[PDB]
Design a protein around this ligand. Sequence first.
Ligand SMILES: C[S@@+](CC[C@H](N)C(=O)[O-])C[C@H]1O[C@@H](n2cnc3c(N)ncnc32)[C@H](O)[C@@H]1O
Ligand code: SF4
Ligand SMILES: [Mg+2]
Lengths: 126, 400, 19, 78, 100, 86, 29
Amino acid sequence: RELPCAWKPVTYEEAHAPHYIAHRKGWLSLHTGNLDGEDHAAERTVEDVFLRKFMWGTFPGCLADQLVLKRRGNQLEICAVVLRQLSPHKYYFLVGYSETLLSYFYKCPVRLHLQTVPSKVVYKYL
Amino acid sequence: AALVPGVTQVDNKSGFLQKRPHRQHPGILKLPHVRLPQALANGAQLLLLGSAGPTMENQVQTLTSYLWSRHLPVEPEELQRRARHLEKKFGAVLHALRKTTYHWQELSYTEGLSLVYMAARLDGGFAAVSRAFHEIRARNPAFQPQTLMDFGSGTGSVTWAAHSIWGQSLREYMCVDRSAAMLVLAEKLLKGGSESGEPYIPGVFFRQFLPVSPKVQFDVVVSAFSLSELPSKADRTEVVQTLWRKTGHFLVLVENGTKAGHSLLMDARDLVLKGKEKSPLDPRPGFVFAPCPHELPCPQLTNLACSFSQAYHPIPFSWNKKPKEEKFSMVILARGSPEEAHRWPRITQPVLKRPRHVHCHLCCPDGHMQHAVLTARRHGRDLYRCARVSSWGDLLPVLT
Amino acid sequence: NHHTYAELMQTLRFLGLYR
Amino acid sequence: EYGHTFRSDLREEILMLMARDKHPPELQVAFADCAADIKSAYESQWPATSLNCIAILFLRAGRTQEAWKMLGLFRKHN
Amino acid sequence: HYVDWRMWRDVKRRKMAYEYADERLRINSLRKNTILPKILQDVADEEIAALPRDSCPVRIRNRCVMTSRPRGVKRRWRLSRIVFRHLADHGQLSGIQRAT
Amino acid sequence: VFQDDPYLMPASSLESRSFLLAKKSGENVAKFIINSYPKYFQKDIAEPHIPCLMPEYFEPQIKDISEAALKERIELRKVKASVDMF
Amino acid sequence: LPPRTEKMAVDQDWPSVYPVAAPFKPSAV
RNA sequence: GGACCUGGCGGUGCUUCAUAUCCCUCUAGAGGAGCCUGUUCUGUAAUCGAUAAACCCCGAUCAACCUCACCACCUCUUGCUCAGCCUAUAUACCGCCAUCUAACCCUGAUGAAGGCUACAAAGUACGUUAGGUCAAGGUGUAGCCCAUGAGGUGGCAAGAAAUGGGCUACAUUUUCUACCCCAGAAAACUACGAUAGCCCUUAUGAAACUUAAGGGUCGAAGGUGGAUUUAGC
Ligand SMILES: C[S@@+](CC[C@H](N)C(=O)[O-])C[C@H]1O[C@@H](n2cnc3c(N)ncnc32)[C@H](O)[C@@H]1O
Ligand code: SF4
Ligand SMILES: [Mg+2]
């Protein structure tokens, strides 16, 4: 009355912070560019950015975790973790489409390695 | 809407367009960076020689921040309403009410806290009051005050500004403060920061309670950062009514440039405009000389505030290096009737200059806020130049 | 390029193969 | 695993072969588990052979209650 | 479809710088030797001046390739500090780790 | 040809054929996009040059009335155009 | 479906399961 | 009205000390000049922001053109996108930072209530702000839309101070040379000292007094600077 009376689940990658990148986490993309003496780091980085945007737009709501972009010689492996929500026929169609389109866009033999999980692999609750 | 494309024209009286540049157009009211009188700064530093250590910096900063973020004392009716909502949603209500409400305390200004308040607010108050007085001085150069009062005259800042502006005509400086320490501080500052000496300004009268005689009307009555200290709306109402009754020519009211200060000054403005006295000794009506170009309710009270700024050089101290800006709200109420019907919009916000266009927020005489983007092609070369040179707190001379 | 990259998204979304 | 869950003839052959003769108790329990799984494959969608064989298998494995429940389905499907 | 007008202006500059590079080099080579007569060096100063102003290799800026930021650009990645830190903190830049 | 993931491994002959047909249809859609808009895939970055990863051109380039354009249309197996030009 | 690692004998020919470089498959390892 | 229980104390004083920050003391420097670099006003046709206060060697690990988003005119218009706006709005939200404000068991006669001793005696288990920020960390909304959009060519005035930061000195524990620590000269006015001014070469560039390096000329003030301030570990 009178005044004086008054008086979220996270995956393993999400759980760990950027300063654990070489201690507990790894690197999502692997290539030779950033090594001492090597060339074309910027080209690989731009390729990585486009690959991530393209995959996230071509597999909407399927990717359970981040992509892993591996590079061996001339090859380009997109190792992704997806859900078991979309039907397998659509997964095969999208894999074929993505392989062909990325192979012709980067002029290299791209290849996808989908791994399905039932649901987001929760590590803790931040 | 006091700015119509192609219809409104710049207001040319006394041939300011022909006989003067555009930078010297009548509606400019900017004040150069304020520097306090050397006597005042010397007195402040001398009085603060006793203790000006690292503790004083923290204390000054805390006092300034608190006096800024402080809210109005909450009236009982609002508390009852909030309590009702709390019970309907539900000691638990009283705790939830302790939170979501501001704890307002009376500030007991003893000697130490008065020293802190001096060191934290003398310069700012002087700057604000100086700009407020400059408003009257610039718009009516013929007015020569002889009598001044200062409610809550804690440091005499109003007295110093009144001297600085009208020292060749003022002869009486009534100062009122319940705080005896603070009266003593004001006297010491006026005597060069020394307990024994000669006052710099002649004719000062210090007091603790207001004058009593009804027939006495003072030309200028000022209250700067003082009404926000009163504990209740009833106290604020009675104080404002008394000041208006004893106002002869101008009542100047200044507060912190927050929503709190704007609301307080608008309540005072509306009280003074809507006269209740059945047969006052002074029958003269009262109007808003500045900064409002009308008498209707503010278009900015609903959710926003209305403030002004004045930049000034702080008193040299261990923590005061760069020039500062004081943000304050003001209102000047004058007895009688408006001088003419050609009143000009007021800029209540920083003018934004951009290539070939100028954003200006105007409070127009019709009683509305107009957010104008002035450009030469749409509004006129002279008007665009006037807009380009006008800034926060100025008057834009447009007619019809 | 930023034309190849941006207009390829435009074509892909219009064909309904990208979100 | 190869998608033949919903083939009737295969179920029929398996149940008949399983219920043909009397087997040691371990294999009887195993055949009872298989018969229960065939039962569930049916409920997830009734030849008299499959019904009778499932009943006999549950009986031989000692799961008397489920056989007595099967007695209801015999009457239900005529 | 570049990031903004400023990036497009710099893409325009880099195009003409490539087209005019051989001619600029040759005309510039005549003026950087104390052998040929001064009559010829003085004219190549006129020939080089008349070439379109954007063809000059000194008017090209290393803006970021993703945000067109004019400064704070690491040339090895062509990425401004804000965009680099975003990718490096997510472990999307191979080999990059925070120092200890 | 299939993927080792349990959710994507075909379980039946019909399912295996269906998955293969879906994959081939996706490849065909990608090929259609690539050939329909070569301008987005002409930028070559591969050393040595890979001819099999470049867009294919199915349109006549010679437009005049001449025997060489006829031979071009015959090389492209464009029957109706070849008859019309003959 | 169940992983195929359940069907792998303890004396199989491992090189045939991973003939070339491939990413880790939990249902195959 | 008698006896008792929990208290709180939203209260004080004193005593000893552990008493780290903050003090105090102690050590070693800088502070007064000449420059530059931000910023303040002023001045100017002439970037911006930093909106109460506490964070300018700030955005910028770099400004001749460009960068550039500022000014003078000139010049184009469905325009790199099909537009485009460094135009406004976080005084629209969102990110961000900031200001302020249990269960069990025993005892008391089964009362409020209480429960420890180790050479062991009942205890075990937020809200707020006419806040900042669009170098967007975001999403929207308002405007301009033959120009709040493009483009071109030139120009951002500078002397009064007020500050911060840095550099360089005022020398003899110094300066030059050899050398890299056993030498020879110079030395207070032809001593030291200028990253002060002016002139000439070299580098880069299309364009250099206008940016940098060196040489010449020059040899200014400076003569160690209190109150203060910077670190210590
Ligand atoms: C703190 S000063 C405000 C600043 C001052 N006006 C200045 O210019 O520096 C306001 C003073 O008003 C005084 N005051 C409070 N209530 C009052 C009242 N009812 N009548 C007169 N003075 C009052 C307080 O003692 C307080 O010191
Ligand atoms: S917005 Fe206009 S009417 Fe309101 S306080 Fe300000 S000047 Fe006065
Ligand atoms: Mg412009």
